[PDB]
């Protein structure tokens, strides 16, 4: 029963060298619970979960001041990286940060993460030992040398092992009804004829949490991977996710193909069939 908290920062430079758009979200076990948009007229950290709204004003004040400090820091680096790579003044660029920590069933620290990216390409990342950096080429090496000589990985480790784990345990306790829940999927199969010689069997799975689900097709007793199609696990808008898998089968042999569904909230892997 492991869990993970993740924050996602996004700073998007403007083509007119204006105020970049800063959007920040936080997820505890695939569940968003906070947000911060520089475009919204509130300019404060907003709640997105019921269990997180119980926090005091000193919480939201500290989270807003720290999320604003990183937004102002990313803005300076945006203009610096724009002049480093001689990028156009009329262009838009993006800086992204991802940090978080993983806890086990006992609530103790397991893994920590801290990685940055510029224009969709990796910039600098904190390794698993939380004492060394892995940087890309050019500007990332300058950041690596700057952060190594400043012992930056030390203070990054203190958060991932202390404040991150402490608040993750608190979130999992105040939101145990939703964070530690396991909604099993509601599965059914459909039939979609292509022509008079072929047909498509689509195996659905709706309303499940967490999003970790494995849909597999099998012709007779062997694994069938040819002429199959899986779609990305899509959300539904109510905290649950959706996913389906299809297979092109010859007409008349639909009962030879069996859909197998594996989910964390299921007592035993399911097996769907029929046309």
């Amino acid at each position: 029963g492991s869990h993970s908290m993740r924050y996602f920062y996004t700073s998007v430079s403007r083509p007119g060298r204006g105020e970049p758009r800063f959007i920040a979200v936080g997820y505890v076990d695939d569940t968003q619970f906070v947000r911060f948009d520089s475009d919204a007229a509130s300019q404060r950290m907003e709640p997105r979960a019921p269990w997180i709204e119980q926090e005091g004003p000193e919480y939201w004040d500290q989270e807003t001041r720290n999320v604003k400090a990183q937004s102002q820091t990313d803005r300076v680096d945006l203009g610096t990286l724009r002049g480093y790579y001689n990028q156009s003044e009329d262009g838009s660029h993006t800086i992204q940060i991802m940090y978080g920590c993983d806890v086990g069933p006992d609530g103790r620290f397991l893994r920590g993460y801290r990685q940055d990216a510029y224009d969709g390409k990796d910039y600098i990342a904190l390794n698993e030992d939380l004492r060394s950096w892995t940087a890309a080429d050019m500007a990332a090496q300058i950041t690596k040398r700057k952060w190594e000589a400043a012992h930056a990985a030390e203070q990054q480790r203190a958060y991932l092992e202390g404040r991150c784990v402490e608040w993750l345990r608190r979130y999992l306790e105040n939101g145990k009804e939703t964070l530690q829940r396991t909604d099993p999927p509601k599965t059914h199969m459909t039939h979609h004829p292509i022509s008079d010689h072929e047909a498509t069997l689509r195996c659905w799975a709706l309303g499940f949490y967490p999003a970790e689900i494995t849909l597999t097709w099998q012709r007779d007793g062997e694994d069938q991977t040819q002429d199959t199609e899986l779609v990305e696990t899509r959300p539904a808008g109510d905290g649950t996710f959706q996913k389906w898998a299809a297979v092109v089968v010859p007409s008349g042999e639909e009962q030879r193909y069996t859909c197998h569904v594996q989910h964390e909230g299921l007592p035993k892997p399911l097996t769907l069939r029929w046309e």
């Binding site: 920040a24 990183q70 820091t73 952060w147 930056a152 990054q156 958060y159 608040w167």
Partner: peptide, 10 residues
């Protein structure tokens, strides 16, 4: 909670 030690790149 969010990260408190803000690091400046470059």
């Amino acid at each position: 909670s969010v990260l408190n030690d803000i690091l400046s790149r470059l």
